[PDB]
Design a protein around this nucleic acid. Structure first.
Length: 105
RNA sequence: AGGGAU
């Protein structure tokens, strides 16, 4: 008995976010952050987040990440929305993989 | 369910 797996949802740069009201969604996250593309939305709190409502984002290289880093603890409608950088120009990978790199890549 | 903030 054996198996195999891959990765396609962590291979990139990222940032964290909160303050997102328990009554709003990603359709306004990637629309208040910056004029950037929607390549950058997710929503989570936990299997115990009462109803969930916080978020996290990802970016195409550190260049797009800093191009969105301009609202540390800004606003959106009625709460002080916040987001905190979690990327650098050299951390696209460093602790995981997505292929056996021995016979399939 | 609220701020945790840097």
């Amino acid at each position: 008995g054996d198996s195999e797996f891959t990765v396609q949802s962590t291979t990139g740069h990222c940032v964290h976010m909160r303050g997102l009201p328990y009554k709003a969604t990603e359709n306004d996250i990637y629309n208040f952050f910056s004029p950037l593309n929607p390549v950058r939305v997710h929503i989570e709190i936990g299997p115990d987040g009462r109803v969930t409502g916080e978020a996290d984002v990802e970016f195409a290289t550190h260049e797009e990440a800093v191009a969105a880093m301009s609202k540390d603890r800004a606003n959106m409608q009625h709460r002080y929305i916040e987001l905190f950088l979690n990327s650098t120009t050299g951390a696209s990978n460093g602790a995981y993989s997505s292929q056996v790199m021995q016979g399939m890549g």
